[PDB]
Design an enzyme around this catalytic site. Structure first.
Site, short mmCIF file in Angstrom:
data_model
loop_
_atom_site.label_atom_id
_atom_site.label_comp_id
_atom_site.label_asym_id
_atom_site.label_seq_id
_atom_site.Cartn_x
_atom_site.Cartn_y
_atom_site.Cartn_z
N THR E 1 4.54 -0.97 14.29
CA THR E 1 3.31 -1.53 13.67
C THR E 1 3.63 -1.92 12.25
OG1 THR E 1 1.76 -0.13 14.94
CG2 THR E 1 0.93 -1.12 12.85
N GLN E 2 3.20 -3.11 11.88
CA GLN E 2 3.30 -3.52 10.50
C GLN E 2 2.01 -4.20 10.12
OE1 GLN E 2 4.31 -5.24 13.10
NE2 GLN E 2 6.36 -6.13 12.79
N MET E 107 5.16 -1.36 20.66
CA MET E 107 4.38 -1.16 19.45
C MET E 107 5.03 -1.68 18.20
SD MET E 107 1.59 0.00 20.51
CE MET E 107 0.65 0.97 19.39
#
Ligand code: MG
Ligand code: MG
Lengths: 249, 244, 211, 222, 233, 235, 231, 240
Positions: E1-2, E107
């Protein structure tokens, strides 16, 4: 991938471990080295047999500091010795100093080196080390000591001994002269006398390598102000210091 | 590839024997003789060092007799370096057991573990076996005083008196002749030294060629003491048993 | 609502038929007895998938057991295969509350309650689901070891009916099983709508309800 | 924080007849209040006389259908071109779904076809793979608008015979494929009126012993 | 996730009788700072495909390298690399869609919305969308971001359904696209005046236009607007 | 030495060819496929009379619709049987159906060339795999340590096999009843066995669509042996 | 001889004997023929039974709708290699929505076989394969050897006595290459070519295996009564 | 890891490492098992080259695997410990998961499976051990006796012997064991077992060990005296 996961040293029908016997033969060919234990010190010594005169043989160190109070010399294969010295210096830290905050006693560092040599005699895809070591040291509770380690991993404590080429003669020479009242200077003198017999050519400070384990050297500590830190007991003698003792010969 | 150079250390011969175990046993038959004798009031371990020298530092030297813990010692016949690998492992198993159960390891449980380790090297891994036979002398509160031996096969057995190393045939015959069940430790000490005296390949038996130990409940009240004899103490017991 | 109880004639298993998502009735035809094999039954409560998936998996393990051992698996062993499995997953979010029911020669009629937090309980009467408390009331006050098979079946049916009436999340229809030593026998699907009126009339119960 | 899931709307409907089955879906694809496409097919012919729809999050739905199609291919390779029967397809899909039990395909799956006696079959799955054979099942956005209607008009729930006042149920007659399709179109016409995510088009796949046929109808585009 | 850092706004596109058009402005924003002013977000693949990308620019630059490496690789041991075994728009799309879904499933998405526009071997128009979630779809008009809300309504008045496509000339389609770009410039706070436009036509091939500007802008009526209610001056 | 996966100059794998030799030393096993069932029979060959011969298990259930007989180094068969059972049960779990006899056979045979320097050597056992499925009816396969499997109307393996196979060549026809197949297996076993055939040193089994795989009681086989004796004495 | 103990040893003349021995297993195999026109490609294979009670061992394996092969040699090795091809065809379809080019399949097989010829402990594959397909550049035929050499051809044969078939196809080349739009004629030329390699036995209804792929023809295998027409 | 195929086929279809494992078994001290009507007896030969042996502590030849099953062996002693440990672990694991102790046959099948695995795994040699495994299934009164060998084959026996000179003692058992009438008491069974070993042993001294196993975990080792009374009574009926 190393696919030699089987022993290269095995028992022959007569009970011999051939590769260990042959490592011992390589040691037999090696240049003579010796050690003598005095009441207040130990001396280890060997010949710097230079391979060419263009070689700068002070850049080849046969007598090695392992800890500030422990030194080593060998007979046999020089490169095997050099890597064992690297491993011995390291194991003194990793399996002792980083745990107890002090350098190992001589006998336990010997024990660790010996174990490394034993494993090269049974582990997969390696040959034994082709060296015998003499390890001299001091520690608080055992005092001065001198050990021999062989290619099998076996080690023994000595009052005085010799290994390599001229060892049978040198050991007889040492049995005559050794007693339990020698002072370090006496043992140095005897070492020099003993070593002369096995040396053909030049015999001086530049062709002999000699170190002692003796008194603490505060002058070699590199710092002052901690009373309990008094300096290393290992000291390599200079070319000049050897020659001074060669007139007194 | 690499197969070409593989000795195959873990194969049967056509008679159903393990080559490397047999050849390790041959190696062990040239080691200095070690003897264990079990009495009602303790155990004796006696062993001959291999041909000495006058310059050997004896009082700091150990080659035959080792402490595994306060209640268990071993006598070694064979490759000393191999023995120390196994000895350190046994010392650790004993401490693991003490940590887990808060009781000292029973002698046989220790012996079985070390023997299983040896056995493994004969069945898998393609490595050479350990060139070592042990005599184990120890005490626990279940069986009391006990003697065992193990050899490179990982086989172990219990004994009232036993020898390993050189001349075990001769030694064993001599022990069998003079051993008696009601015998005491001081009698066992004498039998052990007399037996070494007769079977040695040396000219005479002197203190500087021996290592010696007793495990006695000659520690005050329900408790056991190990005594690894100093060189002077070996010298005295040689005189006192009239061998020198 | 799901229940199972032991009696002289074996085991009665009775379940309702309703599945809901929130207030939405997703189905009234859910099959909440999973037929593990012809001798073993399991009941569905908690997660529908976890119960279906792992109890038909259990049937596979039971079949392998009897191929290898040439003998019917015990209810003890079968139930423990399931509980040991879900215990491995503990903390990962499996949801299961089930009765593993069988009748063997060595054990007699046997029921194990097995649950996704690793519980495994042997017992005589279990009741699981949002309507369980209603079912227990009817069971506890009418249960005997010596019920006939016919009366045992009725009691199981009547207990689910009680739950279906009061519990908003129970209903649709009642499925009945009788587990004997020679296998389970299905005793039909009973719409709760019709069953309620029929029971009210024949029994004179539910006087609170106008029919 | 990254949310790996989405909702693409859509409503699907499977009905099993006596010797046929239909699987229908609207062709509208949405996110939030926007239309992505007015014609993005969502019901698929998977081979072996099986039709499939995985409604909800379209990325997961597409991945699942693709996997199942592939599983049909390998079933043929591994089992001497044996036809994958609808019950076997259903069990297989349970394992595809339950394999992602702890990171599920966010979809409601329905498959339709004929069973091994030639009778119409519909199977319905939850996102982690519990399944059941059913006669009637709507899925997705307008499922709650459609099911009560089908209960009443397919199963004749709450209908009794005039004159008996509740004593005799309306008897459960078998519906023709034309009849079923009328109920499907009215279901979607009604859902289109009252659900914002339903509209644009209706695609029906019909399965009989002769194979798979398609029908398309416009729905309102507002 | 970013989280996206440097970003590109809308990509818009439509089908017409002989091909497809795609357009995107030349800005790389850094939040509300209009940081970078010559960013190309249409990336041609061969002579039959243009991939238009919005969202995170670092990920766009990564995807651009994947596409370049795809071309290199397709040519390996392939005598027909510039003929029958050239990359199709549909191969390029399926590959990108596979990557996007895989990355979301781990993810760790590529934070983009992508439109692949091109013409297939058989002359068929190709237009399909994929985003950071792996969601894909096709329509006669496609747009990302603000373009989805403002461009699509306008483009759908030209091509409202499949049957409108053969009636739509490249002149009508381009003009529709250019007007949509003006509208986005009026109403999207992260848009720029400068854009690129690409036409992939089954007869005339790939026409790639750079340094286009929004023109014919209505601002004059602003002079008459005073206050926010009661102010007259 | 030489690799375990070496080809000979004729293009054969040494180790596979040698395992085939071990199989020739095995006790005999025979199968006969009919339209009413497949029969499987074995010679038990107890090494001493103190060995309880009903503990000799050379016919084995894989699933209800699949049976198996072995010949050779029979300890090697156990992991093969375990695999076959797991594959049959696993297929039913995944597909809610019976696995095909051929698919099961192929799955067992995939194990076979998995040796090297995976297991250290080929299996030293051959299998007769018999069963029924809806698509291809009654079937009998011969699974070898080479990983090859052949379908057969009838087949013998083990030490009596080429005498037995010659026999089967002559006696098999497409109209055999189950009863006729049973007698035939019994008669050919009797022929090639060292000892005198009876119910304690041979064993019969069949697989029928109806009743699935069944190993025959000793009492049931005793009756068939008696019935064989009388039909032979009657010409 | 001293150099044939494993695949990792060159002989003093630069040969690889384990590979040559693997090649020898193909030579013992039953004959199979391949040939193509510009619209179709055909495989014909003579299947071998073990005896009169036994089945005839299948020789032809489908890899995808547009591709398949026939084998001669170790059958389990053909199963390993065809499985690999199925996966690679599959991968190309799923990831790129693209049918795997027959030429690309040949390259992949070469590289897979090559690895088993250069490392310790492996053995080469002991099977030869003829791969036919129809892709974006038309009909193709490939011959694979377990040395890893893969060759594109109009026609060929492998297995015992393949030399007869092969010479026939060499003379017929100018005829069969032109059999476009007539599947049955192409198959006939195939059955005729394979006949040049029979002795003692002839082509029977459980003996003969044929496969075909082309313009509007999924790879399909004919056995049993479906080959009576050509017998 | 060391991977070498030590057990491989020879041109005549023999696996020599397995066959040589049996040669190790032949050399081991003799072991015998005999089932009565309601018991099983295990007798073991003790080679008498070892006096000064301490018999309290020296590993015994019969080993309890669980409270209802015992195992004896002939062959390499060290190897046997590995199988005994594995079997004991498996017996507890079976109790833990099935909630029933192992059947004698299950336990035999397990040990035999371990032996087979060691004949076709890279880098290991076969066990130089054959075993006799005896006892009673839980809640069963029918006696059980099985035999395993290095190849991993196993089978059930009315009576059986393994180890050196087992040809001779099998000779004896085959002529003296009647299946229609097994030794109907502990006494008869123990006497038949001591007789069988006397064919081969030497002194019926502490050369012979006997262990009796009855139903319901009733397992006991006879002492020197009780065996001596069997040895005694056996030779006194002899001179006749
Ligand atoms: Mg479990
Ligand atoms: Mg609207």
């Amino acid at each position: 991938t190393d696919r030699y996961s089987f022993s290269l040293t095995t028992f022959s029908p007569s009970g011999k471990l051939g590769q260990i016997d042959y490592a011992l033969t390589a040691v037999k060919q090696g240049v003579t080295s010796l050690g003598i234990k005095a009441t207040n010190g130990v001396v280890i010594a060997t010949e710097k047999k230079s391979s060419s005169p263009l070689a700068m043989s002070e850049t080849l160190s046969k007598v090695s500091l392992l800890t500030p109070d422990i030194g080593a010399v060998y007979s046999g294969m020089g490169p095997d010795y050099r890597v064992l010295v690297d491993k011995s210096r390291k194991v003194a830290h990793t399996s002792y100093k980083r745990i107890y905050g002090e350098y190992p006693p001589t006998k336990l560092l010997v024990s660790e080196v010996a174990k490394i040599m034993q494993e090269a005699t049974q582990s997969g895809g390696v040959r034994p080390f082709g060296v015998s070591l003499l390890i001299a040291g001091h520690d608080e509770f055992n005092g001065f000591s001198l050990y021999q380690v062989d290619p099998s991993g076996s080690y023994f404590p000595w009052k005085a001994t010799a290994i390599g080429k001229g060892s049978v003669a040198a050991k007889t020479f040492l049995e005559k002269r050794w007693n339990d009242e020698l002072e370090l200077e006496d043992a140095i003198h005897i070492a020099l006398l003993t070593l002369k017999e096995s040396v053909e050519g030049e015999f001086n400070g530049d062709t002999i390598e000699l170190a002692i384990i003796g008194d603490e050297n505060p002058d070699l500590l590199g710092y002052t102000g901690i009373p309990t830190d008094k300096g290393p007991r290992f000291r390599k003698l200079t070319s000049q210091e050897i020659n001074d003792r060669l007139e007194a010969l | 590839g690499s197969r070409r150079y593989d000795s195959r250390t873990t194969i049967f011969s056509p008679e159903g024997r393990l080559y490397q175990v047999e050849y390790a046993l041959e190696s062990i038959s040239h080691a200095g003789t070690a003897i264990g004798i079990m009495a009602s009031d303790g155990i004796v371990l006696a062993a001959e060092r291999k041909v000495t020298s006058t310059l050997l530092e004896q009082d700091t030297s150990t080659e035959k007799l080792y402490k595994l813990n306060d209640k268990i010692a071993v006598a070694v016949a064979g490759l000393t370096a191999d023995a120390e690998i196994l000895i350190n492992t046994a010392r650790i198993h004993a401490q693991n057991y003490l940590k887990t159960y808060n009781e000292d390891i029973p002698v046989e449980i220790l012996v079985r573990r070390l023997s299983d380790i040896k056995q493994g090297y004969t069945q898998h891994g393609g490595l050479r076996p350990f060139g070592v036979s042990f005599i184990y002398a120890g005490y626990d509160d279940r069986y009391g005083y006990q003697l065992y031996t193990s050899n490179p096969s990982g086989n172990y057995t219990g004994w009232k008196a036993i020898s390993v190393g050189a001349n075990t045939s001769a030694a064993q015959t001599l022990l069998q002749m003079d051993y008696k069940d009601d015998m005491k430790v001081d009698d066992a000490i004498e039998l052990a030294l007399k037996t070494l005296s007769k079977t040695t390949d040396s000219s005479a038996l002197t203190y500087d060629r021996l290592e010696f130990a007793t495990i006695r409940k000659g520690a005050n009240d329900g408790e056991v003491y190990q005594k690894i004899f100093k060189p002077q103490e070996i010298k005295d017991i040689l005189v006192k048993t009239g061998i020198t | 609502t799901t229940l199972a109880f032991r009696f002289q004639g074996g085991i009665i298993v009775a379940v309702d038929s309703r599945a809901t998502a929130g207030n939405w009735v997703a189905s009234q035809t859910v099959k909440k007895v999973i037929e593990i094999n012809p001798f073993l039954l399991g009941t569905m409560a908690g997660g529908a998938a976890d119960c279906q998936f792992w109890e038909t998996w259990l049937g596979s393990q039971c079949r392998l057991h009897e191929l290898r051992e040439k003998e019917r698996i015990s209810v003890a062993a079968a139930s423990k295969i399931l509980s040991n499995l879900v215990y491995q997953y503990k903390g990962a979010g499996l949801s299961m509350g089930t009765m593993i029911c069988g009748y063997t020669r060595k054990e007699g009629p046997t029921i194990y309650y097995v649950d996704s937090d690793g519980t495994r309980l042997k017992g005589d009467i279990f009741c699981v689901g949002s309507g369980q408390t209603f079912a227990y009331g009817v069971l506890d006050s009418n249960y005997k070891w010596d019920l006939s098979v016919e009366d045992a079946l009725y009691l199981g049916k009547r207990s689910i009916l009680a739950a279906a009436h009061r519990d908003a999340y129970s209903g649709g229809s009642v499925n009945l099983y009788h587990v004997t030593e020679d296998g389970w026998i299905y005793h039909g699907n009973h719409d709760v709508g019709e069953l309620f009126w029929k029971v009210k009339e024949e029994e004179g119960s539910f006087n609170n309800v106008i029919g | 924080q990254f949310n790996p899931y989405g909702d693409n709307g859509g409503t699907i409907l499977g009905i099993a007849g006596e010797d046929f089955a239909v699987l229908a879906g609207d062709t509208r694809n949405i996110t939030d209040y926007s239309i992505n496409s007015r014609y993005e097919p969502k019901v698929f012919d998977c081979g072996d006389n099986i039709v499939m729809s995985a409604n909800g999050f379209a990325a997961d739905g597409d991945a699942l259908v693709k996997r199942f199609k592939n599983s049909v291919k390998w079933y043929h390779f591994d089992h001497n071109d044996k036809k994958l029967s609808i019950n076997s397809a259903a069990r297989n899909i349970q394992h595809l779904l339950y394999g992602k039990r702890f990171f599920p395909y966010y979809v409601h799956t329905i498959i339709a076809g004929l069973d091994e006696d030639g009778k119409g079959a519909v199977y319905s799955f939850d996102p982690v793979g519990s399944y059941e054979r059913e006669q009637c099942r709507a899925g997705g956005a307008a499922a709650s608008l459609i099911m009560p209607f089908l209960d009443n008009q397919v199963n004749f729930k709450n209908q009794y015979e005039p004159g008996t006042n509740g004593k005799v149920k309306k008897p459960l007659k078998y519906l023709s494929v034309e009849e079923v399709i009328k109920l499907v179109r009215d279901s979607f016409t009604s859902a289109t009126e009252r659900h914002i995510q339903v509209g644009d088009g209706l695609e029906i796949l019909i399965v009989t012993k002769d194979g798979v046929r398609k029908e398309f109808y416009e729905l309102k585009r507002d | 996730t970013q989280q996206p850092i440097v970003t590109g706004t809308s990509v818009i596109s439509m089908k017409y009788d002989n091909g497809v058009i795609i357009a995107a402005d030349n800005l790389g924003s850094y939040g509300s700072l209009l940081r970078f002013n010559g960013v190309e977000r249409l990336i041609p693949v061969g002579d039959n495909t243009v991939v238009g990308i919005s969202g995170d620019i670092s990920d766009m630059q990564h995807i651009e390298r994947l596409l370049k490496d795809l071309v290199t690789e397709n040519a390996y041991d392939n005598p027909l690399a510039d003929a029958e075994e050239a990359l199709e728009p549909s191969y390029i799309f399926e590959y990108l869609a596979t990557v996007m879904y895989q990355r979301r499933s781990k993810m760790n998405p590529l934070w983009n919305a992508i439109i692949v526009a091109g013409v297939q071997s058989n002359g068929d128009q190709f237009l399909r969308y994929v985003n950071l979630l792996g969601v894909t779809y096709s329509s006669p008009t496609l747009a990302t971001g603000f373009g989805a809300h403002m461009a699509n309504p306008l483009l759908r008045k030209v091509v409202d359904r499949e049957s409108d496509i053969p009636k739509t000339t490249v002149q009508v389609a381009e003009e529709a696209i250019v007007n949509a770009m003006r509208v986005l410039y009026y109403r999207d706070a992260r848009s720029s005046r400068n854009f690129s436009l690409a036409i992939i036509d089954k007869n005339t091939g790939l026409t790639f236009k750079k340094n286009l500007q929004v023109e014919n802008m209505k601002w004059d009526f602003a002079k008459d607007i005073k206050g926010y209610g009661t102010q007259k001056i | 030495d030489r690799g375990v996966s070496t080809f000979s100059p004729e293009g054969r794998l040494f180790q596979v060819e040698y395992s085939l030799e071990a199989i020739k030393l095995g006790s005999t096993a025979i199968g006969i496929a009919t339209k009413e069932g497949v029969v499987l029979g074995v010679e038990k060959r107890a090494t001493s009379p103190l060995l309880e011969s009903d503990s000799i298990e050379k016919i084995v259930e894989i699933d209800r619709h699949i049976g198996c007989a072995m010949s050779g180094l029979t300890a090697d068969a156990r992991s093969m049987i375990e695999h076959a059972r797991t594959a049959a049960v696993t297929h039913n779990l995944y597909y809610d159906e019976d696995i095909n006899v051929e698919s099961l056979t192929q799955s067992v045979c995939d194990l076979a060339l998995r040796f090297g320097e995976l297991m250290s050597r080929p299996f030293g056992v051959a299998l007769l795999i018999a069963g029924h499925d809806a698509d291809d009816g009654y079937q009998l396969f011969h699974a070898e340590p080479s990983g090859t499997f052949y379908r057969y109307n009838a087949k013998a393996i083990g030490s009596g096999s080429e005498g037995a196979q010659a026999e089967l060549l002559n006696e098999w026809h497409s109209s055999l009843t189950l009863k006729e197949a049973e007698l035939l297996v019994l008669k050919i076993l009797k022929q090639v066995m060292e000892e005198k055939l009876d119910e304690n040193n041979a064993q019969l089994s069949c697989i029928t669509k109806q009743d699935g795989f069944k190993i025959y009681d000793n009492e049931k086989t005793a009756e068939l042996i008696k019935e064989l004796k009388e039909k032979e004495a009657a010409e | 001889n001293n150099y044939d103990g494993d695949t990792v040893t060159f002989s003093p003349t630069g040969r690889l004997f384990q590979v040559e021995y693997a090649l020898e297993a193909i030579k013992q195999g039953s004959v199979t023929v391949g040939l193509r026109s510009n619209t179709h490609a055909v495989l014909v294979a003579l299947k071998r039974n073990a005896d009169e009670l036994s089945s005839y061992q299948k020789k032809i394996i489908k890899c995808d709708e547009h591709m398949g092969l026939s084998l001669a040699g170790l059958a389990p090795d053909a199963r390993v290699l065809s499985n690999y091809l199925r996966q690679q065809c599959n991968y190309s379809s799923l990831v790129f929505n693209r049918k795997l080019a027959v030429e690309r399949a040949g390259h992949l097989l070469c590289d897979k076989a090559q690895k088993n010829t250069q490392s310790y402990g492996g053995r080469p594959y002991g099977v030869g394969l003829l791969i036919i397909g129809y892709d974006k550049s038309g009909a193709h035929l490939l011959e694979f050897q377990p040395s890893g050499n893969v060759t594109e051809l109009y026609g060929t044969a492998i297995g015992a006595r393949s030399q007869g078939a092969k010479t026939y196809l060499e003379r017929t080349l100018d005829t069969f290459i032109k059999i476009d739009g007539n599947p049955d004629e192409l198959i006939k030329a195939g059955v005729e070519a394979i006949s040049q390699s029979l002795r003692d036995e002839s082509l029977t209804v459980d003996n003969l295996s044929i496969a075909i792929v082309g313009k509007d023809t999924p790879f399909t295998i004919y056995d049993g009564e479906a080959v009576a027409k050509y017998i | 890891g060391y991977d070498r195929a030590l057990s491989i086929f020879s041109p005549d279809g023999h696996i020599f490492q397995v066959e040589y494992a049996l040669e190790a078994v032949k050399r081991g001290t003799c072991a015998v098992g005999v089932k009565g009507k309601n018991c099983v007896v295990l007798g073991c030969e003790r080679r008498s080259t070892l006096k000064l042996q301490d018999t309290r502590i020296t590993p015994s030849k019969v080993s309890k695997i669980d409270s209802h099953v015992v195992l004896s062996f002939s062959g390499l002693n060290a190897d046997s410990r590995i199988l005994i440990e594995k079997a004991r672990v498996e017996a507890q694991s079976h109790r833990l998961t099935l909630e029933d102790p192992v059947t004698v046959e299950y336990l035999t099948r397990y040990v035999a499976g371990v032996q087979q695995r060691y004949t076709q795994s890279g880098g290991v040699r076969p066990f130089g051990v054959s075993t006799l495994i005896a006892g009673f299934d839980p809640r069963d009164d029918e006696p059980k006796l099985y035999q395993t060998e290095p190849s991993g084959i196993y089978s059930s026996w009315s009576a059986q012997t393994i180890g050196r000179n087992s040809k001779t003692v099998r000779e004896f058992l085959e002529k003296n064991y009647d299946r229609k009438e097994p030794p109907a008491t502990v006494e008869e069974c123990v006497k038949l077992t001591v007789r069988s070993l006397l064919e081969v042993v030497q002194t019926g001294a502490k050369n012979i060990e006997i262990t009796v196993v009855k139903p319901d975990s009733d397992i006991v080792a006879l002492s020197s005296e009780e065996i001596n009374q069997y040895v005694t009574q056996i030779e006194q009926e002899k001179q006749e």
